[PDB]
Design a protein around this nucleic acid. Structure first.
Ligand SMILES: [K+]
Ligand SMILES: [Mg+2]
Ligand SMILES: [Mg+2]
Ligand SMILES: [Mg+2]
Ligand SMILES: [Mg+2]
Ligand SMILES: [Mg+2]
Ligand SMILES: [Mg+2]
Ligand SMILES: [Mg+2]
Ligand SMILES: [Mg+2]
Ligand SMILES: [Mg+2]
Ligand SMILES: [Mg+2]
Ligand SMILES: [Mg+2]
Ligand SMILES: [Mg+2]
Ligand SMILES: [Mg+2]
Ligand SMILES: [Mg+2]
Ligand SMILES: [Mg+2]
Ligand SMILES: [Mg+2]
Ligand SMILES: [Mg+2]
Ligand SMILES: [Mg+2]
Ligand SMILES: [Mg+2]
Ligand SMILES: [Mg+2]
Lengths: 202, 99, 63, 138, 146, 132, 101, 85
RNA sequence: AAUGAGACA
RNA sequence: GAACAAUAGUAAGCACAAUCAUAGCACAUAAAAACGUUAGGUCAAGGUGUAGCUUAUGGGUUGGAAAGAAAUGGGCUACA
C-alpha cells in the first residue's frame, strides 16, 4: 500500500532562512521542524516522548513564526507606515501646555465569530481646569454644577458617557457636555444672588 | 438644603439629562424600565437553547448521504432489527389492546 | 433629545410628568435604535387616544 | 540564487488630514499560562524597540476564580470537587505614539496574538480645545 | 494547497491532479448540501455579517407570473424557466421591455438555448437553423444595434 | 474511589496513550487543555456558545473519520478563525483524506459563519505511552 | 428533537415571551408609576393579565442545554453539574483545572 | 437530540454488562454467552440509503480521463446493493 | 456481655 | 518462599513514596490513595440490555397537592 515518505527535515539546509518555512502562525508539524524536541512526563526509568505523534507539542501555541531573526525583518518592512512624534512635545508638561484635553477610548479583541462588545462604547474625557478661561465666579459655579466629577486636589474634570451606542456618538456627546458646561458657568442668572452664608465654599 | 441648592441640583440634572422635577422613589422605576434592556429580550435568554432541531436534522440527512456515520444510531437500528426477528415489535395504530 | 415628539401632549397634566420620565429613560437606553424609540412614543399617543372617556372621569380634564 | 525580483508593492498615500496624537497607549493582555505571556511580552518588546517606542512593561497582580460542585450524582453532599480558573495578567504601556504608528503596531500585535490570550487597549488621545471653547464666546 | 503531512504530500505530477481535484470536489460536494437544504444554515452568529458564507438560492423566490419574477430567472442562469415564463407573459398580453427581451436572447444565444454546466441536476457546427434565438429575433417589434 | 476519566489497571496488556494515562487532577500540571479560547477568561463573555460548538466538533470529527481517528482533537480559536488539529491513522487512501478535508472545511465554515482551518498529522498507529 | 418534552416546552415559552416582551413593557410601565390616575392603572391590570400565560418572564426556566436538568446548572456555561465535570475532567474546557490551595 | 448520543464503545461496554458485581462470586448463572458485534465490519465511506455517488469516496474520481461529478443511483440498482449487504 | 444468616459459587 | 557475621528467590507494572499546587525554602494543609469488600447509592443527569404501553403507562390546557395528634435529628437566637 501507500508508504510514508521521509520527512523534509533531512532535506532542510543548515543555513536556510527559517521564516520562509513558517510565514504565518501554524501548528507544530513534526516533519517541518528540524529541532528534536521532547516533552511529557517521563516513565519511571526512561525519557520523555519524541516529537512525532506527540499531542503535548501540539497543544502549545508555538512561536516559530515570530523568531527574533524574523521579527527584525518583519518590523523593518513596517517602518514605512509610520510618522514621527513631534520632538517639541518631549516633556509631558509641554503636552499639557499645548494639548489640554485627553480622551480615553477602549477597543476589545476576543476569539469568536463576533466583535460586538457593549463595553467598548465608553468615552472618558479629562480636562485640566487650569488651562481654561474660567473667572473667579464662573469657576466656582462650574464646580458646584458638575458635582463629584471634579477632583479638588488634582484639579481635573472627568466626564464619562455611556448612553450613546457608538464611541463616535459618545465622543460627540462628551465634547457637547464640556462646551455647554462652560457657556453656562458664565451666565450670572438673577436668582444666583440669593446665596446663603452656609453655602459659601470659603 | 436651601433654595440655592435646589436650583443647582435641577440645573445640573437638566444638562446631564436626568429628571428635573422631583420624583417619587416608586416612580423612578418607569425610568429604569426603559433605561435597561428587558429580561425577555436579552441575548442570554431567547438564544439560551441551541437549536437542536437543526443539529439533529442535519446529522440525520448526512447519515443517509454517507458523509457522516453515527455509531449510536446504528446501535439502535441493529437492536431494533433483532426485536423484529424475535417477534416483539411495535404494533400499528389501533392494535394495542382493542383486540 | 426627544422633546420634538412630545408636541401633541397636555403640557400641564400628569401626562407630561409621565411622558418626560419615559423620554428620560429612553435617553439613557443604549440598546434601542432611534426608529424603535419613536415607536414607544407613538404607542403612548395611540393608547391615550383610544382611552379618552376614562381620563374625563379621572378628575382632571386632559387634552 | 533564483529569487522573485522586487516582489513588494504597497502604497501609502500621504493625505492632508493632521495625524492623531495619542498621549499614552495601554495594552493589557490576559491569559491562563504565564509561559505564553512571558514569550509574548518578549515579542512585543523586541518589535517596540525596533520601531522606537520606549515602552514599559509591568505585571498586574493575578486573580483566581473558584467554585464548588457536588461530587456524586445522588446524595453524598459531604464530598465536594472544586475547580479553579486562573487569569494571569501583563500590561505593556506605550507613550508618545502617533496615530499612524499606532495602527501598524496594534494590527501587527493583534494578528500574532496566541489563541489562549486576549487583550484590551486603552488609548489616551489628546487634542486641543473645542472651537466653541477656544473661540471666545462670552 | 496540499497538507504538509508526509503521507498526504504528493509524490508525482500525476498525484497532484488527483489530489487537488479531490479537494475541489469536496468543496462542490459540501456546497451541494448547503444549497440542497437552506434551512439548516440560516442561523447567523457572524458579526460583522459575512454575505459570502450564507447559503444561496437557485429556485425562483417568486412563483407568481410577473415581469419582476421573470427577471429573477434570467439572472439566476435559468433558461427553461425563463423561456416558459416569457411565453406565458406574451400570452397574458402584458408588454415586455426590449432590453429584457435582448437580455433573454443573450442568455439563450450563449448556451444555444441550453443549460449551463452545473454540479448535478468539438467538430461540427453547434449552431442550429431551427433555434429559438432566430425565432425570438424575428418576433422582436423593434431591433436596435445591440 | 474516584473514576473520572480514568483507565483502570488490567495486568500489563492494554496500551494507553499519553492523554488517557493521566488522571484529571493532573490537568495544568502534566497535560494541557485540549481546547483553548477566550470564553473562560476572567472578564470575557460568550462562553456558552464556544462550549456547545466545541462539543459538536468532538462529535463531528469522530464521525467524519470512522476508525481512523487516533485520539482527541485540539481546537484553537484565533481572531475569528477556527483551527482543528487531528491525528489520523493510515487507513483511508489519500484521495479520501483530501475529500474529507475539503468537505469538512467548507461545511463547518458555512455552518458557524467563520473560517475553519483543518490540519492533519498522520501516524502509523496509536502512540503508546505506558503498559504494552 | 430536543432531549425531552420539558425542553421543548421551554423553547415555546421563551419564544412567546420574546414576541410580547415590548408590549408587556409598555403596559407594565403604567402600573409601576403612581403619578397616573388610579382608574387608568386598574384598566392596565386587566389588559396585562389578558395576555397569554406563557408570555411571562418569570415562567422561563433555566435548564442544561445538553441533558435538561432543571437544577444544578451553572449560569455561565449553561451546563448541568454532571456534564460540566464530564467536559472539565477530560481537559476539554480551556482554563478549567482542579482547585488546589 | 444529537448531543444525547454516545460512542459505540460506551454502548457495548454497558450492554454486555461484563464488569458488574454479578460476575464476581458466581452470582450470574445465565450460562448464555452474550456476543458483541462490531457494527463497523461492513463500511463503505460515502455509501448511504439515498444512494449518492460521491466522486472520490466510492466511485473513481477520473473516468476515461474525465473527472466524474456528483450523481445519484437508480432505484433498481440501489435495491441490489442493499441486498448484497 | 444472652440472642441473630434466609435462594451467593 | 525471610534470616545481613544472610538459610531460595529475581527484575519490572499499579499504589504508597518522591514531585506538583497554596507565587522563597521549610513545616502544615490541600491533592492523591491500587486490587478488592458492602449484589452499598443512583433506570428520575444522560445513554442503554431485557420486559411492558401504543386513540394510551403518550401529548396539551385549567385548577388543586391541604393539615400536624404526636415522636425525633441537625441548626439559629437565648436563658444575662
Ligand atoms: K429502560
Ligand atoms: Mg430521555
Ligand atoms: Mg403590586
Ligand atoms: Mg424561576
Ligand atoms: Mg454500578
Ligand atoms: Mg430465644
Ligand atoms: Mg517505593
Ligand atoms: Mg511548595
Ligand atoms: Mg508535605
Ligand atoms: Mg482529602
Ligand atoms: Mg502522595
Ligand atoms: Mg442492592
Ligand atoms: Mg449501608
Ligand atoms: Mg435503592
Ligand atoms: Mg430513560
Ligand atoms: Mg423509580
Ligand atoms: Mg431500551
Ligand atoms: Mg397524561
Ligand atoms: Mg424532643
Ligand atoms: Mg448537617
Ligand atoms: Mg443579642
Amino acid at each position: 500500500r501507500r508508504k510514508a515518505l521521509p520527512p523534509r527535515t533531512e532535506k532542510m539546509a543548515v543555513d536556510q532562512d527559517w521564516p520562509s518555512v513558517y510565514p504565518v502562525a501554524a501548528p507544530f508539524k513534526p516533519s517541518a521542524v528540524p529541532l528534536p524536541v521532547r516533552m511529557g512526563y517521563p516513565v519511571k526509568r526512561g525519557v520523555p516522548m519524541a516529537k512525532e505523534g506527540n499531542l503535548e507539542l501540539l497543544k502549545i501555541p508555538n512561536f516559530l513564526h515570530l523568531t527574533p531573526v524574523a521579527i527584525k525583518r518583519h518590523c523593518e518592512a513596517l517602518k514605512d507606515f509610520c510618522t514621527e512624534w513631534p520632538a517639541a512635545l518631549d516633556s509631558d508638561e509641554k503636552c499639557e501646555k499645548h494639548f489640554p484635553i485627553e480622551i480615553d477610548t477602549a477597543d476589545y479583541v476576543s476569539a469568536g465569530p463576533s466583535i460586538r462588545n457593549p463595553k467598548a462604547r465608553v468615552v472618558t474625557l479629562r480636562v485640566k481646569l487650569s488651562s481654561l478661561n474660567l473667572d473667579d465666579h464662573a469657576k466656582k459655579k462650574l464646580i458646584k454644577l458638575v458635582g463629584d466629577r471634579y477632583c479638588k486636589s488634582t484639579d481635573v474634570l472627568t466626564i464619562k458617557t455611556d448612553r450613546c451606542p457608538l464611541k463616535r456618538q459618545n465622543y460627540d456627546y462628551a465634547v457637547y457636555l464640556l462646551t455647554v458646561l462652560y457657556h453656562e458657568s458664565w451666565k450670572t442668572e438673577e436668582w444666583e444672588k440669593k446665596k446663603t452664608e452656609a453655602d459659601m465654599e470659603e | 438644603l436651601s433654595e440655592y441648592a435646589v436650583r443647582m441640583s435641577r440645573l445640573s440634572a437638566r444638562l446631564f439629562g436626568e429628571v428635573a422635577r422631583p420624583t417619587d422613589s416608586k416612580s423612578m422605576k418607569v425610568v429604569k424600565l426603559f433605561s435597561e434592556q428587558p429580561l425577555a429580550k436579552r441575548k442570554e435568554t431567547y438564544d439560551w437553547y441551541p437549536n437542536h432541531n437543526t443539529y439533529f436534522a442535519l446529522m440525520g440527512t448526512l447519515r443517509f448521504l454517507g458523509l457522516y456515520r453515527d455509531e449510536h444510531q446504528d446501535f439502535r437500528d441493529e437492536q431494533l432489527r433483532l426485536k423484529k426477528l424475535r417477534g416483539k415489535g411495535k404494533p400499528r395504530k389501533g392494535e394495542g389492546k382493542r383486540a | 433629545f426627544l422633546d420634538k415628539y412630545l408636541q401633541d401632549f397636555p403640557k400641564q397634566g400628569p401626562i407630561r410628568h409621565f411622558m418626560e420620565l419615559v423620554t428620560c429613560g429612553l435617553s439613557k437606553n443604549p440598546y434601542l435604535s432611534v426608529k424603535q424609540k419613536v415607536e414607544h412614543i407613538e404607542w403612548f399617543r395611540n393608547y391615550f387616544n383610544e382611552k379618552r372617556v376614562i381620563l374625563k372621569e379621572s378628575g382632571i380634564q386632559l387634552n | 540564487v533564483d529569487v522573485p525580483k522586487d516582489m513588494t508593492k504597497p502604497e501609502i498615500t500621504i493625505s492632508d488630514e493632521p495625524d492623531t496624537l495619542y498621549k499614552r497607549l495601554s495594552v493589557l493582555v490576559k491569559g491562563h499560562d504565564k509561559a505564553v505571556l512571558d514569550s509574548y511580552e518578549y515579542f512585543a518588546v523586541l518589535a517596540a524597540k525596533e520601531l522606537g517606542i520606549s515602552i514599559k512593561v509591568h505585571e498586574p497582580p493575578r486573580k483566581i476564580e473558584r467554585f464548588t460542585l457536588l461530587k456524586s450524582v445522588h446524595i453524598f453532599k459531604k464530598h465536594r470537587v472544586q475547580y479553579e480558573m486562573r487569569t494571569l495578567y501583563r500590561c505593556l504601556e506605550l507613550e508618545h505614539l502617533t496615530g499612524s504608528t499606532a495602527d501598524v503596531y496594534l494590527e501587527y500585535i493583534q494578528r500574532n496574538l496566541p489563541e489562549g490570550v486576549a487583550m484590551e487597549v486603552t488609548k489616551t488621545k489628546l487634542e486641543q480645545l473645542p472651537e466653541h471653547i477656544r473661540k471666545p464666546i462670552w | 494547497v496540499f497538507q504538509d503531512d508526509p503521507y498526504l504530500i504528493p509524490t508525482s505530477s500525476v498525484e497532484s491532479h488527483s489530489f487537488l481535484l479531490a479537494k475541489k470536489s469536496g468543496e462542490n460536494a459540501a456546497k451541494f448540501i448547503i444549497n440542497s437544504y437552506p434551512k439548516y444554515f440560516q442561523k447567523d452568529i457572524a458579526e460583522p455579517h459575512i454575505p459570502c458564507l450564507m447559503p444561496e438560492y437557485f429556485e425562483p423566490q417568486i412563483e407568481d407570473v410577473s415581469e419582476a419574477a421573470l427577471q429573477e430567472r434570467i439572472k439566476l442562469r435559468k433558461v427553461k424557466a425563463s423561456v416558459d415564463m416569457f411565453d406565458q407573459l406574451l400570452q397574458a398580453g402584458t408588454t415586455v421591455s426590449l432590453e429584457t427581451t435582448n437580455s433573454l436572447l443573450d442568455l439563450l444565444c450563449y448556451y444555444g438555448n441550453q443549460e449551463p454546466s452545473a454540479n448535478y441536476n468539438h467538430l461540427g457546427v453547434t449552431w442550429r437553423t431551427k433555434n429559438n434565438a432566430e425565432r425570438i429575433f424575428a418576433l422582436m417589434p423593434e431591433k436596435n444595434a445591440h | 474511589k474516584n473514576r473520572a476519566a480514568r483507565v483502570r489497571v488490567s495486568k500489563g496488556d492494554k496500551p494507553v496513550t499519553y492523554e488517557e494515562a493521566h488522571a484529571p487532577h493532573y490537568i495544568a500540571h502534566r497535560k494541557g487543555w485540549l481546547s483553548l479560547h477566550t470564553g473562560n477568561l476572567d472578564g470575557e463573555d460568550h462562553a456558552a456558545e464556544r462550549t456547545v460548538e466545541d462539543v459538536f466538533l468532538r462529535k463531528f470529527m469522530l464521525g467524519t473519520f470512522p476508525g481512523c481517528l487516533a485520539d482527541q482533537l485540539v481546537l484553537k480559536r484565533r481572531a475569528n478563525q477556527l483551527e482543528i488539529c487531528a491525528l489520523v491513522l493510515r487507513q483511508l487512501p489519500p484521495h479520501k483524506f483530501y475529500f474529507l478535508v475539503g468537505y469538512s472545511e467548507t461545511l463547518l465554515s458555512h455552518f458557524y459563519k467563520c473560517p475553519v482551518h483543518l490540519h492533519l498529522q498522520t501516524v502509523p498507529s496509536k502512540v503508546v505511552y505506558k503498559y504494552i | 428533537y430536543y432531549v425531552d418534552w420539558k425542553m421543548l416546552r421551554d423553547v415555546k415559552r421563551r419564544k412567546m415571551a420574546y414576541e410580547y416582551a415590548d408590549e408587556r413593557l409598555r403596559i407594565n410601565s403604567l402600573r409601576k408609576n403612581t403619578i397616573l390616575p388610579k382608574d387608568l392603572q386598574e384598566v392596565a391590570d386587566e389588559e396585562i393579565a389578558s395576555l397569554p400565560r406563557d408570555s411571562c418572564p418569570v415562567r422561563i426556566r433555566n435548564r442544561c442545554v445538553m441533558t435538561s436538568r432543571p437544577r444544578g446548572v451553572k449560569r455561565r456555561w449553561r451546563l448541568s453539574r454532571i456534564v460540566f465535570r464530564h467536559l472539565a475532567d477530560h481537559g476539554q474546557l480551556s482554563g478549567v483545572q482542579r482547585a488546589m490551595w | 437530540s444529537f448531543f444525547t448520543k454516545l460512542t459505540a464503545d460506551e454502548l457495548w461496554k454497558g450492554a454486555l454488562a461484563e464488569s458488574g458485581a454479578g460476575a464476581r462470586k458466581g452470582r450470574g448463572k445465565r450460562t448464555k454467552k452474550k456476543r458483541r458485534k462490531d457494527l463497523n465490519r461492513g463500511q463503505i465511506i460515502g455509501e448511504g440509503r439515498h444512494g449518492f455517488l460521491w466522486p472520490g469516496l466510492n466511485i473513481p474520481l477520473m473516468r476515461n480521463g474525465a473527472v466524474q461529478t456528483i450523481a445519484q443511483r437508480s432505484k433498481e440498482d440501489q435495491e441490489k446493493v442493499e441486498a448484497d449487504m
